Amino acid sequence: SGFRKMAFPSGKVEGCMVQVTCGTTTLNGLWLDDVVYCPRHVIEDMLNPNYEDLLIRKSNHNFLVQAGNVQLRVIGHSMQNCVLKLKVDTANPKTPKYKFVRIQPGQTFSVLACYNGSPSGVYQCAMRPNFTIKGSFLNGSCGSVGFNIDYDCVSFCYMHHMELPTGVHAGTDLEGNFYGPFVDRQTAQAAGTDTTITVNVLAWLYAAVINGDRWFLNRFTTTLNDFNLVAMKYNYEPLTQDHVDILGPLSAQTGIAVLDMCASLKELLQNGMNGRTILGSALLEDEFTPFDVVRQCSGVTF
Amino acid sequence: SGFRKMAFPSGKVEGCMVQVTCGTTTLNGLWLDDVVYCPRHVICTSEDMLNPNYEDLLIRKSNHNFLVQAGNVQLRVIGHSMQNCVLKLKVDTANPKTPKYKFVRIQPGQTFSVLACYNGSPSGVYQCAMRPNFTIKGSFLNGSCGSVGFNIDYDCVSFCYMHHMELPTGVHAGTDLEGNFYGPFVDRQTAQAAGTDTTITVNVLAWLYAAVINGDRWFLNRFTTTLNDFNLVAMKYNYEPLTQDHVDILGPLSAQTGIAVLDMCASLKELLQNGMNGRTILGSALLEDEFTPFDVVRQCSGVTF
Ligand SMILES: C[C@@]1(C(=O)Nc2cncc3ccccc23)CNS(=O)(=O)c2ccc(Cl)cc21
Numbered sequence: 001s002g003f004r005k006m007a008f009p010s011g012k013v014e015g016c017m018v019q020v021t022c023g024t025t026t027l028n029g030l031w032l033d034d035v036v037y038c039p040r041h042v043i044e045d046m047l048n049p050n051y052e053d054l055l056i057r058k059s060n061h062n063f064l065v066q067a068g069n070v071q072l073r074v075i076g077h078s079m080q081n082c083v084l085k086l087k088v089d090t091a092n093p094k095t096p097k098y099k100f101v102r103i104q105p106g107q108t109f110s111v112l113a114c115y116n117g118s119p120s121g122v123y124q125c126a127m128r129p130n131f132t133i134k135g136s137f138l139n140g141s142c143g144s145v146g147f148n149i150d151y152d153c154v155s156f157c158y159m160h161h162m163e164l165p166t167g168v169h170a171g172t173d174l175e176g177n178f179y180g181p182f183v184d185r186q187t188a189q190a191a192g193t194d195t196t197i198t199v200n201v202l203a204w205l206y207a208a209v210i211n212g213d214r215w216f217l218n219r220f221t222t223t224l225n226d227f228n229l230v231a232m233k234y235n236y237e238p239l240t241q242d243h244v245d246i247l248g249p250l251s252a253q254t255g256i257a258v259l260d261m262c263a264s265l266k267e268l269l270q271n272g273m274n275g276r277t278i279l280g281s282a283l284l285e286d287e288f289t290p291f292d293v294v295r296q297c298s299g300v301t302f
Numbered sequence: 303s304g305f306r307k308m309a310f311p312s313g314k315v316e317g318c319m320v321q322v323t324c325g326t327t328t329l330n331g332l333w334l335d336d337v338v339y340c341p342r343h344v345i346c347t348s349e350d351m352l353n354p355n356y357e358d359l360l361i362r363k364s365n366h367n368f369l370v371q372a373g374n375v376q377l378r379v380i381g382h383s384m385q386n387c388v389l390k391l392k393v394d395t396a397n398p399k400t401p402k403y404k405f406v407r408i409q410p411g412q413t414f415s416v417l418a419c420y421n422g423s424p425s426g427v428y429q430c431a432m433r434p435n436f437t438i439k440g441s442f443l444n445g446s447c448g449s450v451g452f453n454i455d456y457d458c459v460s461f462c463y464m465h466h467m468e469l470p471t472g473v474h475a476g477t478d479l480e481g482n483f484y485g486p487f488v489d490r491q492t493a494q495a496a497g498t499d500t501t502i503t504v505n506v507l508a509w510l511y512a513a514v515i516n517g518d519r520w521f522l523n524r525f526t527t528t529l530n531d532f533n534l535v536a537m538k539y540n541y542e543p544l545t546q547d548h549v550d551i552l553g554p555l556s557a558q559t560g561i562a563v564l565d566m567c568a569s570l571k572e573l574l575q576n577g578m579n580g581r582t583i584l585g586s587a588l589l590e591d592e593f594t595p596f597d598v599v600r601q602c603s604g605v606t607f
């Protein structure tokens with residue numbers, strides 16, 4: 001029993017974190033085999049940077065890379081989108097089995113927050129529909145990474161680049177493509193209006209049922225179209241037939257049809273919780289995917 | 303900016319997790335140097351759990367009855383002893399991945415990270431607090447026994463908890479790494495129940511200071527309170543008594559934000575009376591009590607917004 005916001009074990013990622021320094025800027029890098037990946041902004045310049053022009057002026061020896069108490073030697077450098085790839089003379093002996101994957105809004109991942117190449121904490125989060133993440137990052141956290149683990153393989157999906165004025169965060173995949181309409185420069189940028197991840201709220205309601213919290217269940221059902229009229233009114237993301245199919249296993253385990261759980265969610269949106277909580281929360285939680293619920297209620301290991 | 307329930311990076315603890323098997327029971331063990339620590343109930347059957355005589359069950363075992371697996375390698379047990387509710391299995395190999403560590407016994411209100419494991423394999427990491435009733439609200443399925451709680455301030459891992467049991471309300475009980483249970487619990491299937499739980503007042507105050515540091519002040523008021531009047535009100539909402547030690551501990555957060563501890567106590571009294579009125583504090587519609595004053599200082603910026 002119990003249901004916690006749970007992150008993947010971070011050890012495989014901790015063994016890849018390094019410190020990258022270029023002039024006066026210090027941030028984090030990801031060392032995989034003989035390449036260190038980091039935000040290209042490590043190189044007033046932020047007001048209107050020409051990254052190729054700034055990069056051409058740097059030599060390999062300008063980049064200082066520290067792995068623990070050992071200085072790595074940079075022997076090459078190149079830019080791929082908003083990520084800088086620093087070729088080093090030593091392959092990381094702790095390189096795990098890995099892939100670079102781009103995630104979609106609604107998908108969750110663990111973040112290993114680092115400062116000066118040293119991991120400080122691990123937390124779970126979701127890529128919001130507005131492509132930001134509600135992280136916890138201070139100055140020096142740039143280059144910290146997000147990931148999932150599938151079997152023994154780490155799938156790196158996020159690298160931290162920026163904090164927006166509302167205190168939310170923006171970054172790229174490991175190929176340097178930003179999530180969202182963001183750019184790596186100091187200009188007027190803002191998080192768009194966000195919405196609630198409907199399929200994740202439904203998954204969390206199934207998790208509450210599995211754990212014995214059933215007060216919100218009712219005898220009613222709804223059509224997918226009528227539910228989506230309700231979802232649009234409360235700034236909830238539209239629920240698709242794909243989402244219904246994905247929730248199939250949780251529906252079979254609890255005996256509650258997906259559209260029957262949608263009718264419970266409709267009543268919670270229109271009437272509130274009435275002084276009650278679900279899994280110790282007074283808000284409808286949307287940062288657990290259907291897969292996260294199945295994994296935490298089955299004990300999958302890595 | 304931001305404020306998350308953050309766990310310590312788990313790598314140093316992952317390298318210590320092993321699987322311990324005794325007959326038909328399989329659970330997790332913590333391998334530090336040449337000793338594997340695990341719950342002594344690994345030697346019990348389900349029938350033994352009503353009234354186990356651990357001394358009598360243990361004397362019938364030899365070293366070769368304990369199977370310890372570390373990854374894909376079988377470790378050889380060369381000795382065994384019981385210390386309180388923990389079994390210590392001496393093995394013929396010192397863990398090459400043993401971090402710098404200490405065994406520390408914590409007090410209610412303290413937080414720690416839990417690395418949940420099954421079959422000696424880590425599955426997830428989450429942040430917990432030792433409740434005032436000495437239980438933890440964990441997430442543990444069958445096979446999670448032996449999973450550990452820890453803090454990693456600096457390069458040293460301080461192990462503070464080992465999982466033993468799930469109570470009828472779905473909350474969890476365990477021991478320190480010397481095998482002493484937290485709370486009035488026994489590693490026996492007896493009528494055991496979590497006592498009435500209360501809210502960790504000093505932690506709610508720390509989290510209100512975290513909200514002020516991150517730029518939110520809507521909940522503040524023009525009032526102050528005496529410590530005694532605060533305690534008389536807070537106990538009516540099942541909040542733990544606030545002591546002078548708690549007031550002293552909140553001193554640094556009080557100096558950083560410019561809000562006196564008893565002035566923040568007045569704000570908490572008003573929040574308990576009014577609720578949030580559709581508002582949230584650090585993205586929560588409830589008063590959060592699983593962040594200590596030390597956690598807030600560690601996570602938050604040193605410059606108030
Ligand atoms: C590097 C920087 C940034 O966001 N840093 C931070 C990133 N994360 C958390 C933080 C917390 C507190 C201060 C800074 C933080 C600097 N600010 S900026 O507007 O010039 C900008 C603009 C674009 C990009 Cl891609 C990065 C940045």
Ligand SMILES: C[C@@]1(C(=O)Nc2cncc3ccccc23)CNS(=O)(=O)c2ccc(Cl)cc21
Nearest residue numbers: 001343351442443444466467468488489490491
């Ligand atoms: C080992 C056991 C226990 O609590 N197992 C579990 C421990 N943690 C989480 C779980 C979840 C789902 C089922 C079981 C769980 C067995 N039950 S018992 O009442 O006989 C008992 C009594 C005392 C002690 Cl120290 C352990 C146990």
Ligand SMILES: [Cl-]
Nearest residue numbers: 407408409412
């Ligand atoms: Cl303590």
